[PDB]
Amino acid sequence: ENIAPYKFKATMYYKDVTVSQVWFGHRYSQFMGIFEDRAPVPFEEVIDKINAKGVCRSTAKYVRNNLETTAFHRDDHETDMELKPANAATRTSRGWHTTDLKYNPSRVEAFHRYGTTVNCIVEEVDARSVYPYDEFVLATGDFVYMSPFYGYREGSHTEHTSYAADRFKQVDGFYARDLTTKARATAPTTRNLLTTPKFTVAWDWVPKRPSVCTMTKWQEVDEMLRSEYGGSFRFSSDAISTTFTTNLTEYPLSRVDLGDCIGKDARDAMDRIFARRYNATHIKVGQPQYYLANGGFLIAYQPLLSNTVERIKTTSSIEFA
């Protein structure tokens, strides 16, 4: 059984907006409040500004608590700002930002003053999803309630989604721009972009069926002897000292949910082994057969001769074998 979540790399775009209120006393200054918020970067700015020129806007315009709000960095006019790399930290993915210093209001004696700062942040994160792949979570602990394989092509519209159709956008012929080397890729890619109320996610779209596997290849056995006894099949391997018991009937591979993976992996492994070791001594007998063994194991078996819809649960213990 496959327990490891499906992993894919995604990109987060968001503006950190900080508004600070300060009271300036006779000899001292004090914070009366710091409002910190995260705003999504619009698709217009992700495609037209960040990806096309490598810059980001100095203003954050977004909907929060049902209100169209605009914030200006340094409380000045709107300009474009270069995205520069963040400070290096061990075991941290790449990241880019525009500003580094907080803007606080100039001192005027005995007044409460407000000051706004906008920091446009781009990050690369690793996103993980689990069966049935209707949600995926980012490295920052923020969930995205939409299937990683959602789209407009190849029957991907039937995938689960919880956001309005105005929040999602699939752009084809998207040429990704590397933000460090400033070199643009040549192969076009499909890009899914979702604007959550807190941030914007973008990731490469891939079809669901050939991307995930509900069963994972565990062992390759060169010599797994098969015997028929007591209305059952015994598969015994001396290399791993392990014996499985199966019913005499085949297990159809179509019954396995998301089972396009087992056939290809088994064929590759068995062909490699046969070419390596048994090319000059034995011959294959028929196409590979698939059996289900106690414990919930899936055995792909290719018999040899000398020249002369449900999900399977696998136990954590191998001691019974």
């Epitope: 217009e44 495609i47 037209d48 096309a52 020129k53 474009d80 789209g151 407009y152 092509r153 190849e154 956008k169 699939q170 752009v171 084809d172 012929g173 040429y175 721009r177 643009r184 076009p188 499909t190």
Partner: antibody, heavy 119, light 105 residues
Framework: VQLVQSGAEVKTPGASVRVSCKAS????????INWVRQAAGQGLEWMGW????????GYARQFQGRVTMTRNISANTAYMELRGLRFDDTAVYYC???????????????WGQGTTVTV | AGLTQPPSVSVAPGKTARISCGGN??????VHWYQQKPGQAPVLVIY???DRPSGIPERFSGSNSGNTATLTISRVEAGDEADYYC?????????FGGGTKLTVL
């Protein structure tokens, strides 16, 4: 994706023309459709853009009121309609994937063969 | 608005070619350069002001700054005789340049 247009068109002044551009290989709903015309030996002249997913359109100032862009999603085809032709509209017309809903900075990477319209 | 291009440019086969595309505040826009041989659909040769599509030789290069974009063709071959168009997006349209005819002597 590949774009294929219709054949040549021969019309009298005051008539209407519909040029069809069909995509192949994709859903055709993930990009935009630009219609751009070129006269005989003259430079390129943009006519308009359409978003086939939502049906939103945008026309040039010199073509407003005479150009209608529509789509058939089931056949993945985009139609452009010119109404009230005159003598200067004899040109070769092209459909491309470029700017529009997907971004104002897109590039016309893929083009069609072009249809010759003679008035 | 409009983009201004030189009507004609002629360069010796061994030399290099400069094609200009002028406009007000053109440095804030992504300029694309298309090449059209006679009786063919235009083919993109430069996108996003510095980048080349797949299958494009290194001879082509681009720049965009201030009020001018520039296309540079090093080692002008005999097969580079074509019409070159610069394109940006202003307001809600894509203004096209008048085109420059590159003649190889």
């Amino acid at each position: 994706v590949q774009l294929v247009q219709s054949g040549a068109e021969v019309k009298t002044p005051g008539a209407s023309v519909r040029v069809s551009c069909k995509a192949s290989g994709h859903t055709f709903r993930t990009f935009d459709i630009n219609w751009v015309r070129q006269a005989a030996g003259q430079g390129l002249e943009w006519m308009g853009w359409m978003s086939p997913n939502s049906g939103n359109t945008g026309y040039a100032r010199q073509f407003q009121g005479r150009v209608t862009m529509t789509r058939n999603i089931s056949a993945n085809t985009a139609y452009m309609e010119l109404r009230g032709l005159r003598f200067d509209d004899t040109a070769v017309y092209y459909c491309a994937r470029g700017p529009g809903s997907t971004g104002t900075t897109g590039s016309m990477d893929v083009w069609g063969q072009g249809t010759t319209v003679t008035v | 608005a409009g983009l201004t291009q030189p009507p004609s440019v002629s360069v010796a086969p061994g030399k290099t070619a400069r094609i200009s595309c002028g406009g007000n505040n053109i440095g804030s826009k992504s300029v694309h350069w298309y090449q059209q041989k006679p009786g063919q659909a235009p083919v993109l040769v430069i996108y996003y002001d510095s980048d080349r599509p797949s299958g494009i030789p290194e001879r082509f290069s681009g720049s965009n700054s201030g009020n001018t974009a520039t296309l540079t063709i090093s080692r002008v071959e005999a097969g580079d005789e074509a019409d070159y168009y610069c394109q940006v997006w202003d307001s809600g349209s894509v203004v096209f340049g008048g085109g420059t005819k590159l003649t190889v002597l």
